[PDB]
Amino acid sequence: VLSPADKTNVKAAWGKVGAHAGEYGAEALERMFLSFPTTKTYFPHFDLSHGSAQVKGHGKKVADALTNAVAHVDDMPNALSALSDLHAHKLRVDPVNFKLLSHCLLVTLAAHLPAEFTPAVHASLDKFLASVSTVLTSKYR
Amino acid sequence: VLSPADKTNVKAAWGKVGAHAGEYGAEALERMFLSFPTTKTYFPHFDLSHGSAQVKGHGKKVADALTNAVAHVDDMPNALSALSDLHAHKLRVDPVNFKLLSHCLLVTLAAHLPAEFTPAVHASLDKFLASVSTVLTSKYR
Amino acid sequence: VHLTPEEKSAVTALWGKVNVDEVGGEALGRLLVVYPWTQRFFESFGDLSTPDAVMGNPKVKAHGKKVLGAFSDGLAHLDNLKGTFATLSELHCDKLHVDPENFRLLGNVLVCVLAHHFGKEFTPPVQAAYQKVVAGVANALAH
Amino acid sequence: VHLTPEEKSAVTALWGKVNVDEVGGEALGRLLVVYPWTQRFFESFGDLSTPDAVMGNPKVKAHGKKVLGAFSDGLAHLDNLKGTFATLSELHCDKLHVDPENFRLLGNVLVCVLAHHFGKEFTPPVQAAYQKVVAGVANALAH
Numbered sequence: 001v002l003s004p005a006d007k008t009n010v011k012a013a014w015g016k017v018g019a020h021a022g023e024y025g026a027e028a029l030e031r032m033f034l035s036f037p038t039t040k041t042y043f044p045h046f047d048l049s050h051g052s053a054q055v056k057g058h059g060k061k062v063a064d065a066l067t068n069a070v071a072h073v074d075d076m077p078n079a080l081s082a083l084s085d086l087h088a089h090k091l092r093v094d095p096v097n098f099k100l101l102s103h104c105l106l107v108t109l110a111a112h113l114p115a116e117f118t119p120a121v122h123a124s125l126d127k128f129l130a131s132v133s134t135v136l137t138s139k140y141r
Numbered sequence: 142v143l144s145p146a147d148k149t150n151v152k153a154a155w156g157k158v159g160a161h162a163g164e165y166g167a168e169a170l171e172r173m174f175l176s177f178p179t180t181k182t183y184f185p186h187f188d189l190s191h192g193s194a195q196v197k198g199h200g201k202k203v204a205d206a207l208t209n210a211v212a213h214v215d216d217m218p219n220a221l222s223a224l225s226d227l228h229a230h231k232l233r234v235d236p237v238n239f240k241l242l243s244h245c246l247l248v249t250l251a252a253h254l255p256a257e258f259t260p261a262v263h264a265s266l267d268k269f270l271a272s273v274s275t276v277l278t279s280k281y282r
Numbered sequence: 283v284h285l286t287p288e289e290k291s292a293v294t295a296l297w298g299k300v301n302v303d304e305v306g307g308e309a310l311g312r313l314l315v316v317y318p319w320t321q322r323f324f325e326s327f328g329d330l331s332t333p334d335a336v337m338g339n340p341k342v343k344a345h346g347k348k349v350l351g352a353f354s355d356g357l358a359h360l361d362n363l364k365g366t367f368a369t370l371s372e373l374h375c376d377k378l379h380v381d382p383e384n385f386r387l388l389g390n391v392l393v394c395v396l397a398h399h400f401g402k403e404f405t406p407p408v409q410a411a412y413q414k415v416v417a418g419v420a421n422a423l424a425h
Numbered sequence: 426v427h428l429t430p431e432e433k434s435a436v437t438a439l440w441g442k443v444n445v446d447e448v449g450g451e452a453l454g455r456l457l458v459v460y461p462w463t464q465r466f467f468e469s470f471g472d473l474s475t476p477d478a479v480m481g482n483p484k485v486k487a488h489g490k491k492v493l494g495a496f497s498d499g500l501a502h503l504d505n506l507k508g509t510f511a512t513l514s515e516l517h518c519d520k521l522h523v524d525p526e527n528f529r530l531l532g533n534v535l536v537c538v539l540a541h542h543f544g545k546e547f548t549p550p551v552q553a554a555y556q557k558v559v560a561g562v563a564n565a566l567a568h
C-alpha cells in the first residue's frame with residue numbers, strides 16, 4: 001500500500017509537472033517505442049515518428065489517466081476499472097510492457113524535474129506506477 | 142481479483158491435497174532449493190539435505206500459511222499481515238523468489254494431483270499464488 | 283549450458299518416454315490458458331476461446347510438436363544453443379521477438395506438464411536438471 | 426551486442442561527460458533506496474538505514490565507481506561481453522549470483538540517473554542506445 005509520504009511525493013511531483021503532463025506522456029511513449037521496439041506492435045496503425053500528432057494525443061490520454069489515478073489514489077481499482085478491462089481483456093497487453101512504460105515515465109520525469117526527482121520521490125513514483133500497473137493487469141481472462 | 146470460479150477451484154485442489162499439505166510444502170521447498178540455488182542463501186542455517194526435518198517443519202509452516210490465505214481469501218492483506226512484514230521488512234526476500242516458489246508449488250501439485258490439475262485449475266492456482274506473493278511483497282521499506 | 287552427467291541422465295531418461303505428439307500441445311495450450319496475453323502471439327492459430335477450445339486447437343497441437351523439437355535440438359547442442367536456434371528464430375521474421383519472460387513462462391509450463399504426466403518420477407533433482415535446460419533454451423530463443 | 430554507429434556515437438559522446446566519481450554511487454545508492462531488498466546483497470557495506478545514509482555511504486560510492494568501470498569495459502568490448510566480464514564475476518565467488526532481474530534494475534536506475542544529470546540531452550534516441558548496452562552488460566554479468 002502507498003504510504004502517506006508516497007501519496008504526498010506523487011502529488012508534489014505531478015504538481016511540478018503542471019501543464020506539461022500531456023507532452024511528458026508523449027515523450028514517455030516515444031522513449032518506450034525507441035528503447036523497447038516490441039511495444040510498437042500494439043500500435044501498428046499509429047505513425048510513431050517524432051512529432052507525430054497521434055503519439056501526442058495518446059500521450060495526453062495516458063497522462064490524464066495517471067492524473068485520475070493520482071486524484072483517486074485510494075480508489076484506483078474502481079477509478080481505473082474501464083482501462084483495466086481495455087488493456088488486459090481487450091488489447092491483451094503483455095504485463096511486462098507496463099514495467100517498460102513505467103520506467104520510461106520515470107526517465108521522463110527525471111529529465112524534466114532535476115530538483116524534484118530525489119531518491120525518496122523516485123522510490124515513491126516507482127511504487128505508484130507499479131500500483132497503477134497492477135490495476136491495469138488485474139483483469140486477464 | 143480472484144473470481145468465484147478461482148476461489149472454488151483453489152478450495153477444491155486444497156481439499157484433494159488434504160492432510161498431505163505439510164509434506165507437499167516440504168517438497169515444494171526442496172524443488173525450489175535444487176532448481177533455483179540462489180534461494181538457498183536465505184536458509185544458510187538450515188540443513189537442506191533430502192529428508193531434513195528442518196525442511197519438513199518449514200514446509201508445514203508454509204502450507205499452513207497458504208491454507209490460512211485460502212480460508213480468508215477475501216481478506217488476504219489482513220490475514221497475511223505479519224508474514225508480509227516478516228518477508229519484506231525483516232528478511233528482505235527478493236520478490237523474484239516468490240515466483241520461483243509459486244512455480245515449485247504448482248509443480249508439486251501437478252506431480253501429486255494428476256486429475257485435479259486441469260488447465261482451468263492450473264490457471265486458478267497460478268492466480269491465487271500470485272495474489273499471495275503480491276501480499277507478501279507489499280511492505281518493502 | 284553445461285549439464286553434469288547425472289543431470290544429462292535425468293533429462294535424457296525421462297525425455298525418452300515423453301509422448302511427443304501431445305506434451306507439446308498441452309504445454310503451449312496451457313500457456314495460452316494460464317497467461318492469456320500469449321494468445322495475441324498466436325492470432326493466426328484460429329479459435330482460442332476457452333480452455334477446452336485452446337487445448338483442442340490443431341495448430342496449437344502442431345506447433346506444440348515444434349516446441350518439443352526445439353527442446354530436443356537444445357539438449358543435443360547444449361554448448362552452442364545460439365548456433366542451434368539461429369535459423370529457427372530467423373525463419374520466423376519477427377515472430378519470436380517478444381519479451382524473454384514469455385519463453386521462461388513456456389518453459390515453466392512445460393515443466394508443470396512434465397510433472398503432471400510423470401508424477402513421482404519427476405523428482406526434485408529431475409526438475410532441477412530440466413530447469414537448467416529450459417532456462418538455456420529460453421535465453422537462446424529470445425536473443 | 427551490436428550498436429549502430431549512431432548508437433555508438435550517442436552513448437560515447439554523453440559517456441565522456443559523465444562525472445565518474447559520483448554517477449555510479451548515485452545509481453547504486455538509488456538501487457538500494459528504490460528496491461530495498463538489494464541492501465541484502467550489500468550487508469557488508471555498513472549503514473544503509475535511510476536514503477540520506479545510503480547515498481552518503483562511502484562503500485556505496487566506491488563500488489559505484491566500479492559499476493561505471495564495468496559499463497566502460499562493456500562499451501569497449503560489446504561483441505564479447507562474456508569474455509570481458511568473466512574475471513569480474515569469478516573474482517566475486519558467489520556474490521554476483523543473484524537473479525538477472527536485479528542487474529536489469531541496476532541498469533535502469535543508471536539510465537534514470539543519466540536522465541537526471543543530463544536532462545534534455547538524454548534524448549529518447551540516446552536512451553534507446555543506452556538501453557541496448559545496459560541490457561547486454563546485465564545479461565553478461567548475471568551469467
Ligand code: HEM
Nearest residue numbers: 039042043061062065066083087091093097098101102132
Ligand atoms: C501507465 C500505464 C498506462 C496507462 C495509464 C494507459 C492509458 C491508456 C488510455 C487512457 C488509453 C485510452 C486511449 C483513448 O481512449 O484514446 C489506452 C489505450 C491503449 N493502450 Fe494504454 N495505458 C498504459 C499502458 C499501456 C502499455 C504498456 C501498452 C502497450 C505497450 C498500452 C497499449 C495501449 C493501446 C494499444 C491502446 C489503444 C490505442 C489506440 O488504438 O488508440 N498501454 N491506454
Ligand code: HEM
Nearest residue numbers: 180183184202203206207224228232234238239242243273
Ligand atoms: C508462498 C510464499 C511463502 C509463504 C506462504 C511463506 C511462509 C512463511 C512462514 C509461515 C514463515 C514462518 C516460519 C516460522 O515462523 O517458523 C516464513 C519464514 C521464512 N521465509 Fe517464507 N514464505 C513464502 C515465501 C518465501 C520465499 C520465496 C523465501 C525465500 C526464497 C522465503 C524465505 C523465508 C525465510 C528465510 C524465513 C525464515 C526461516 C527461518 O529462519 O526459520 N519465504 N515463511
Ligand code: HEM
Nearest residue numbers: 323324325326327345348349350351352370373374377378
Ligand atoms: C514459441 C516458440 C516457437 C517454436 C519453438 C517454433 C518452431 C517452429 C519450427 C521448428 C518451424 C519450422 C517448421 C517445422 O520444422 O515444422 C516453425 C515454422 C513456422 N512457425 Fe513457429 N515456432 C514458435 C512460435 C511461433 C509463433 C509465435 C508463430 C506465429 C504465428 C509461428 C509461426 C510459424 C509458421 C507460420 C511457420 C511456417 C510453417 C507453418 O506453420 O505453416 N511459430 N516454427
Ligand code: HEM
Nearest residue numbers: 466467468469488491492493494495513516517520521531
Ligand atoms: C553489482 C555489480 C558489481 C560490480 C560491477 C562490481 C565490480 C567490482 C570490481 C571491478 C572489482 C575489482 C577491481 C576494481 O576495484 O577496480 C570488485 C571487487 C570487489 N567487490 Fe565488487 N562489484 C559488484 C558487486 C559487488 C557485491 C554485491 C559485493 C559484496 C557483497 C562486492 C564486493 C567486492 C569485494 C569485497 C571486492 C574486492 C575487495 C575490495 O576491493 O574491497 N562487489 N568489484
Ligand SMILES: O=Nc1ccccc1
Nearest residue numbers: 027050051052545548
Ligand atoms: O522537441 N524538440 C523537437 C525536436 C525536433 C522537432 C521538433 C521539436
Ligand SMILES: O=Nc1ccccc1
Nearest residue numbers: 353385388389419420
Ligand atoms: O524447451 N522448450 C522451450 C521452448 C521455448 C521456450 C522455452 C522452452
Ligand SMILES: O=Nc1ccccc1
Nearest residue numbers: 323378380384385388
Ligand atoms: O512469441 N513467441 C513465443 C515466445 C514464448 C512463448 C510463446 C510464444
Ligand SMILES: O=Nc1ccccc1
Nearest residue numbers: 496528531532562563
Ligand atoms: O553498465 N552498467 C551496469 C552494471 C551492472 C549491471 C547493469 C549495468
Ligand SMILES: O=Nc1ccccc1
Nearest residue numbers: 520521523527528531
Ligand atoms: O549481484 N549483485 C548485484 C547487485 C546489485 C545489482 C545487481 C546485481
